[PDB]
A paper describes a structure:
Remarkably, the affinity of full-length GR for the two elements was very similar, with Kds of 34 and 51 nM for the SGK1 (+)GRE and the [name] κBRE, respectively. Using X-ray crystallography, we solved five crystal structures of the GR DBD bound to κBREs from the CCL2, ICAM1, [name], PLAU, and RELB promoters, at resolutions ranging from 1.85 to 2.30 Å. In each structure, GR DBD recognizes an AATTY sequence, with Y representing a pyrimidine base. Through the side chains of Lys442, Val443, and Arg447, the GR DBD makes contacts with four of the five bases within the AATTY motif. Arg447 recognizes the first two bases of this sequence: its guanidino group makes van der Waals contacts with the first adenine and a terminal amine forms a hydrogen bond with the second adenine in the motif. Finally, Lys442 makes a moderately strong, electrostatic hydrogen bond with the purine residue opposite the final base in the AATTY motif. Two-dimensional (2D) homonuclear [1H,1H]- nuclear Overhauser effect spectroscopy (NOESY) NMR analysis reveals that the in-solution GR DBD-binding footprint on the [name] κBRE is consistent with the crystal structure. The largest chemical shift perturbation occurred at guanine-21, which is directly adjacent to the first adenine of the AATTY motif. This is in strong agreement with the crystal structure of the GR DBD–[name] κBRE structure, as the GR DBD makes two close interactions (2.7 Å) with the DNA backbone at this position. However, when bound to the [name] κBRE, these “D-loop” residues were not affected, confirming that when GR DBD binds to this DNA sequence it does bind as a “D-loop” engaged dimer.
GCs exert their effects by binding to the GC receptor (GR), a ubiquitously expressed nuclear receptor that drives both the activation and repression of its target genes. GR is normally sequestered in the cytoplasm and binding of GCs to its ligand-binding domain causes GR to translocate to the nucleus, where its DNA-binding domain (DBD) binds canonical activating GC response elements, or (+)GREs, which are pseudo-palindromic hexameric sequences containing two AGAACA (or similar) half-sites separated by 3 bp. Here we demonstrate that GR binds directly to κBREs and propose that direct GR–DNA interaction at these genomic loci are an important mechanism to repress the expression of pro-inflammatory genes. Taken together, our results demonstrate that GR binds a conserved, cryptic sequence within a subset of κBREs to repress pro-inflammatory transcription.
Numbering used by the authors:
A (entry chain B), B (entry chain A): 418 to 490
The structure:
DNA sequence: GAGGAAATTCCACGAT
DNA sequence: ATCGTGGAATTTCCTC
């Protein structure tokens, strides 16, 4: 019943300091390692869920950071 | 003329009835025969330009239709 | 020449 | 680390 704090999909455990699913954990790692320039086509307010998380890496990454995800955790 | 009526990128000609670039031509063909399930993570006003057009297929497809693109043209 | 469309290449995403 | 899937976009080939 525990949910990913980023996309609300069911969580696989505590990854990089935050309860998250597998895809969001892999996304965050790749985002930090690659130092990605992401641009929201919206207002930087996008809905991030299982379906929509692919739409805006910018808002997804922002949510990762604001939830406290860090590589050195 | 030039300037694709969907994303404002340089237009390659009149495709499916509308002045469009090459990428919006094949996008529309894919989307119109496909499901076009697309969900917007924003307010369905997403900015569609050369940089952001990949972010929201929902809004891109909506702009294709509003511009008047159709298969039977 | 135009434009439709397959073929091709590239990449994000995500499971294992 | 492979690696499958699917979308994106350019390149190549088709008919008219
Ligand atoms: Zn998640
Ligand atoms: Zn966004
Ligand atoms: Zn376009
Ligand atoms: Zn949108």
């Amino acid at each position: 019943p525990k949910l990913c704090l980023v996309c609300s999909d069911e969580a696989s455990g505590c990854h990089y300091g935050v309860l998250t699913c597998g895809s969001c954990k892999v996304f965050f790692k790749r985002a930090v390692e690659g130092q990605h320039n992401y641009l929201c086509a919206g207002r930087n307010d996008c809905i991030i869920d299982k379906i929509r998380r692919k739409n805006c890496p910018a808002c997804r990454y922002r949510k990762c950071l604001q939830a406290g995800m860090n590589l050195e955790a």
